[PDB]
Write a protein that binds this ligand. Structure first.
Ligand SMILES: *[Se]c1ccccc1C(=O)Nc1ccccc1
Ligand SMILES: *[Se]c1ccccc1C(=O)Nc1ccccc1
Lengths: 373, 369
């Protein structure tokens, strides 16, 4: 008889696959820490994304992310995710990226940083589009931070406070543990392949709708409440139609997500025009959902305030998933470097529950098969 | 106080899925596709397209369709990079929706369209940009996708070479759960489009640690052609410290069924390197077992994969792409199985890093704006 482990969980839910020193998503304590440093501390003191990238990868504020070299994007497919996923994979031949097996830690760290900032450059060019002239390097070179250079390359003359919005969002979305995309990067890195191939694979896993973390569409709901005037009526109407309230649902932490609280505070101080309506919608959505089902513990998803912050920086909705990918490159690179030092291939097992030995003549459609008989 | 739950890193020996696709019966020394032995499939010369349908669908009847005309848009100098990048760009132009928004029939059709697209991309990339493309009219004269692949790449393929590739691809179609197959399932579990899953799996196959890629034995095989004594040459390689390529421990009970199948194909098709290769196999096996009478030493399947692939005029740099082409059958079958399972793959990790500390206490804080 074919048996299965007693604590068999399809999808490896709750199974410990690694021990990491990178970050601690303290869901019981309601805090998020990068190498022991709270994200609230990082975002309150206005630490740029390039420095947080160094902190996660290196464990200290050693060497920040360098600027991207001039490299026009070679892929124009109409999908920003596809453009950067394919673009990164082709960096290995032209830049001579060796397999992770054949390089030391210092080479891998430089390669990770070089490609990480190239992914940001590729997204900015793809977002700008092919029907618009490229921004000259001189305007980009006037900027001081990586985040500022990204917006300048994409928008030309971005609002300085919109740059501050992206830094708050990118830091808050830099790393959140062993998600599907981070797991994908570590598995590819565990084969010894080049860092470009590992980053490209993780981009593909992030594209999936079920991955979680991409900003949900809440602008149609926010626009309606601004027009109607009563938030409680709008949320009740959406629920009464059999639809789901976007941006709200089951709790992830024990309470309010620390990333969600950080993003809401950023929208207030930076002067988000939608902040007043968004707060009113949040309290109405919580009150309606916490009363209709008083048993569930329901909090606000971080994707609700991520959309508000990204919309404030004038990011189109179809571009929002790409903004999430750009920030997550810090967490991806940190886990890739840690996996290289770990030095063990990741290969789980599978239990066969299929048919037993059967002759080919016993398979449906065998007569159609052409053979030497 | 921070303690792990009696684990080892890398998920070794941990069951992640149950599968109906294939059973690598290592303790019985047999490999079966949906219960069908690969030895039976090869002995009756079942083509790769039919085996692709058997793995994905569980039955024959609708094999791999011919590839549509599409000149390869990526020329990076690496065949793996070309196909991996090219497959990812199929989604926007072909309207590939995420796996969450399509039914099984749509997913199966999209997998077949991309799977045969990957073979065409590899053939075009191998042929290079310094040569004109083979016209579609000549390709249509062929009857199988394996013959279409050789025609698109070489132009005037030897019929024996086509049979050699067909035998190798069947044995390399699927070998259970591995890093590349695991990667394809993980990406599919997010609901992403099948093109993204295949592109990610190709990157996983690129890694040297994956295993199964054709062994580097040509310099050694060329050597025994000179000396003429297999026994003398192998002993020298061990004596000066190097490792005999293509030989190692046991994988199955005694013999890998794919290795026996591939070797039988070499003699059936009159491979010139066959006589030398068998002599090296016996010389390497006898000396390795004699030096270490405890460890079970058996011929790696990748040793005979190099012999068969080289016979078909496949260069050494192309051999990893050849392995990628054959494995597309297994990846497509597992992606469809993952689609029906509908459970996201999301493991957990334990934090063993530094405790809560202020940013000022971290080294290098003074160099931060
Ligand atoms: Se971009 C740019 C262009 C000219 C002068 C200064 C800048 C700049 O760095 N702006 C900025 C960076 C970071 C945060 C807010 C604003
Ligand atoms: Se390809 C080709 C071109 C012209 C005529 C016949 C073929 C052909 O089918 N060759 C072949 C296919 C499969 C196995 C052996 C040979």
């Amino acid at each position: 008889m074919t048996v299965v482990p007693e604590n068999f969980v399809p999808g490896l839910d709750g199974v410990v696959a690694f021990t990491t020193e990178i970050a601690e998503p303290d869901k019981d304590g309601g805090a998020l820490r990068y190498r022991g440093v709270d994200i609230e501390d990082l975002v309150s003191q206005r630490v740029t994304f390039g420095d947080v990238w160094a902190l996660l990868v290196d464990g200290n504020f050693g060497s920040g992310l360098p600027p991207a070299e001039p490299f026009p994007l070679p892929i124009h497919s109409g999908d920003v995710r596809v453009d950067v996923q394919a673009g990164l994979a082709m960096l290995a031949p032209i830049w001579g990226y060796a397999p992770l097996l054949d390089i030391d830690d210092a080479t891998a760290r430089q390669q990770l940083a070089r490609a990480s900032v190239m992914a940001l450059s590729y997204v900015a060019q793809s977002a700008r589009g092919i029907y618009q002239p490229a921004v000259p390097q001189r305007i980009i070179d006037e900027c001081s931070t990586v985040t500022a250079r990204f917006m300048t390359r994409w928008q030309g003359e971005p609002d300085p406070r919109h740059i501050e919005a992206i830094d708050a969002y990118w830091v808050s979305a830099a790393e959140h543990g062993m998600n599907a995309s981070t797991f994908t990067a570590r598995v590819i890195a565990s084969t010894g392949a080049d860092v470009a191939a590992a980053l490209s694979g993780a981009i593909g896993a992030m594209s999936g709708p079920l991955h979680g973390g991409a900003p949900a569409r809440v602008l149609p709901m926010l626009d309606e409440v601004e027009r109607a005037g009563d938030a409680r009526s709008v949320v009740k109407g959406i629920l009464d139609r059999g639809e789901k309230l976007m941006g709200f649902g089951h709790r992830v932490y024990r309470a309010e997500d620390p990333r969600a609280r950080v993003l809401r505070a950023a929208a207030e101080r930076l002067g988000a025009p939608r902040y007043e309506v968004a707060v009113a919608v949040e309290q109405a959505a919580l009150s309606e959902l916490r009363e209709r089902r008083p048993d569930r513990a329901i909090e606000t998803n971080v994707e609700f305030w991520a959309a508000v912050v990204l919309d404030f920086a004038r990011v189109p909705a179809n571009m929002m998933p790409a903004m999430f990918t750009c920030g997550r490159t810090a967490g991806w690179c940190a886990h890739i470097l840690e996996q290289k030092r770990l030095g063990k291939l990741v290969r789980p097992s599978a239990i066969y529950v299929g048919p037993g030995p059967r002759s080919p003549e016993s398979v449906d459609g065998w007569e159609r098969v052409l053979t030497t008989a």
